[PDB]
Amino acid sequence: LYPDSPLTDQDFNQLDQTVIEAARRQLVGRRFIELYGPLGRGMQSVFNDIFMESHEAKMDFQGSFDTEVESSRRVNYTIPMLYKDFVLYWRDLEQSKALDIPIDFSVAANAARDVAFLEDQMIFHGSKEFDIPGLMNVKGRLTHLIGNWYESGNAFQDIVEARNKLLEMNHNGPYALVLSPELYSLLHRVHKDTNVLEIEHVRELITAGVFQSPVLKGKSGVIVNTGRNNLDLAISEDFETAYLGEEGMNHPFRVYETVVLRIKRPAAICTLIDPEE
Amino acid sequence: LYPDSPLTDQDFNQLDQTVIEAARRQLVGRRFIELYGPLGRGMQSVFNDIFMESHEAKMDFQGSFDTEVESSRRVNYTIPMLYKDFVLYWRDLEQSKALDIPIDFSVAANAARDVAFLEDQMIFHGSKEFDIPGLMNVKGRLTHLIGNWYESGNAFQDIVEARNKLLEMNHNGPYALVLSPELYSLLHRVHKDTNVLEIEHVRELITAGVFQSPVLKGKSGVIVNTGRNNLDLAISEDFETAYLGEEGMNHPFRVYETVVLRIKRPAAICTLIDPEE
Amino acid sequence: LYPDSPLTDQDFNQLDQTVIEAARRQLVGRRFIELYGPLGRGMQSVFNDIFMESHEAKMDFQGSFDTEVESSRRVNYTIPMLYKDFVLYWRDLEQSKALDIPIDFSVAANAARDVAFLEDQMIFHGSKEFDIPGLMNVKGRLTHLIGNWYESGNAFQDIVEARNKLLEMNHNGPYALVLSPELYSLLHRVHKDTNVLEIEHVRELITAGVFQSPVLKGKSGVIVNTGRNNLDLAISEDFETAYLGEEGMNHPFRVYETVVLRIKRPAAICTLIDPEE
Amino acid sequence: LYPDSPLTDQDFNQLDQTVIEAARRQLVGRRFIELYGPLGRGMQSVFNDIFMESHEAKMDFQGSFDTEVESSRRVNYTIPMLYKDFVLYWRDLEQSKALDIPIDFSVAANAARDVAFLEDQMIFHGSKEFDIPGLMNVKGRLTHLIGNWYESGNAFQDIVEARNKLLEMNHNGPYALVLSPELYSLLHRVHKDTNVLEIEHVRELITAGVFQSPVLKGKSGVIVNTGRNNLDLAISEDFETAYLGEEGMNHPFRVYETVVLRIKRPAAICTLIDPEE
Amino acid sequence: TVGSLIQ
Amino acid sequence: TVGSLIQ
């Protein structure tokens, strides 16, 4: 807020346009996941209905008197916080205050870069303390084994199995696909006497993107069906910055963000488990 | 008045008279427990920071510029529903309106007595649907055996040691004793060598009601001290009756109230167990 | 407020005093059964819904899609008339008028005794020509047999086992006990090693009164819980008198009353039959 | 009234009432010990003077010339501050005004529980850092054994012997008693063959509130006689709630109290000591 | 119009 | 909104 913090109301936005523009280069979490609304500050806990069952529509001339619905199985979660703090400098802020040059916030781009990687640590593995399930740790999640992802044309064969393993559970739509950086540095390469790039044969089946996230540190990946009706993450407070105090003679700040992802139908995620052990 | 209301307004308050008068003569849980503020519709979760220890320090001179706080143990609860429904017939309403007698509500009192017993069964035992800990299953609750609560005057003598174990944990003040109906008859005999009734020896020793609740087993009882910041009853909605849509030609109804007990400090309870099985 | 009579209206309401003043002294049926308001003259039939099944509430979540109610099994009743007539002589009414002595109505107070004891049989054993069931003749009435009521202390033991058959079918709260004059004399013994009277040792567990009525037989007894939803005494007229004319030369009268006993939930009654066989 | 705060003036007064409601319910030192005037913050050291069995009087007829006063032996004590700090969180405080619920304050009563308990640990056992003596550490205090008053009638017989040992040094007046809780529960049996509890025969022999405290660990108890010319504690500043800025988007606080205890005549204390050997 | 109720 | 509020 403004307890006469040493930044005016006009150059406070240049601290926010540095955070909000250096974050979105690094974030592959919310590039295929629909956002929930800004829940505000009256909310610390959200619910989600784990359905795990399906039905189908009807077709007749007049309506029916009865009403058909599903089961919910409500589970309650809490909303964790994610912070990382930086610090400016008197005799460096006072130079730009007295010389009227734009004050730099190049430390703030390094701070907001780490809390974006800490979001993708949470959104792909789940925080263990608040027991919220990750995208690879949920139960009933359609496993699939791979083999020798190196040879000529053994990838598009090994990825059409995981689609048809997921298609018999009646989940057909725009699939997304995240890969470990070992796989993405092994999918398109140069070969022996085959010269196929092996990605344009995969980009047409997928049609929501083949990304590359360094959080999957081994060599694995997931195939997920997108959509708000399947999984979405809940924001209570977006990328905001605040002012702590004046310890010593410098000025610290803190970036923070409160995000929990809730899955609704866990039978629309297929994880390439990679038998390598 | 919001609904289409087959009852008029002047006798709809007779339903709110009967549903709260027949509930007052059966509710022993909140007769000694402090009651939280009505949170309204906009809150459907609650937390409590469970304190269990002492952490005494800081007996020195001026200054000591630091900060040292205590341990939290935070958990969140979900407020349950606690509903029960009943039904009123037409051709019995029009009969009571034709020859102009006041309508009966001898089925609404059976609905009010039913919810006010499950609300009392929840507080004294807890629910495994939401892991709400009861008043006898809470963790670290200072149990105490009994040893022949029948004869010769070792009934009043057994309360004083149970009062003593709260006193060693820096807990005193107005105690409150709730024990089973089969043991409440055992505090009716004369005390030996003084020819006074034993329940007069213990009403000076507890300083609140020695109540009697029918939702209990045989040899069992609980002694606790009252007040806020020890244990209280988080309420969200009192006994309001809702008019369901008059289906067919009759008029059904439903009474409901949503409440949850939260225990702040579990060391201030003591449980008479008598394990003789 | 009376058209014609051989009495002053200031004198006539002295007769309505002594016909109800010597009536509430005798009555024991209306002592624990909250009856009704009046019903007017134009109601010769009443309906009662024998439920015969009851169960608890539910506490799950935001609601359900049905109204789980009990059965009804509607039965029609008719309203009898209980009466007794007395005669008030000329030449004593004339003799009390000449020399100004206040007239005694001590035939009428004797008359309202017999209409309040004939009323007391249909509320216990029930009628036959209108087949209204009594309080010891209904179906599904939770019978219980005992014996040897007076040896040391097993009188108090014999009813805690009786309320346990009544507590496990979800009926609790305020109870009431009616004992025959043979059993009530045995309950005034002194208790062994409690050293208080055995009747006072049981009047804190039944908590709304033990009673003694001569309408019962020898070894018998009934424990039932009070309130509405279980018992009802639907009424149409209270103890009113009526002139009958100047037949012969004297003046007769008639007192009358119109009651029924409708039992709603018959599972909440018990019966201490106490045989030796 | 405040310099500045993150709370409301109507609300900061409610914090000051939670900290002094939960103080009067806890401490036992200021219940039988007369108070000194509030010295403010101008005082930082107090002066007391031991006396130890002072002089006699004169019985002359016309007077005398020289003035004969006794000894003083002035020792200079220093005033410490006793404190314990607690925090009101950033998230939970800010949420309670987003949906209009009055703030919890159960942390503050748990902080006043500490600093009032440590205030009893200073007066009953003394602080080594500042070298001020307690009520069981003072030099010359008339020790007396207890001889295991456990089950017989020597409970009343032993503390009348302590009152005799202190009465032969010309110390009359209203004595007071403070006991261990192991002994205080032991004092609630019936007196032998005289139909009264021990605790009612004792309270007429002491007549200024036989108390208890858990700061006495083993089997022990002291007996003093009150009086401002004999024993008092010097207050300088009572329980005030300080405010310490904010570090990490949180609001800490601190409750504190400055007090010493100065004994004047050490021959007014008598100490029951329990040699179990 | 109620005439005689005891309780 | 209250309406039972038992002591």
Place this chain on the structure above:
Amino acid sequence: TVGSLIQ
């Protein structure tokens, strides 16, 4: 201006 004085 004393805080808490008990008898």
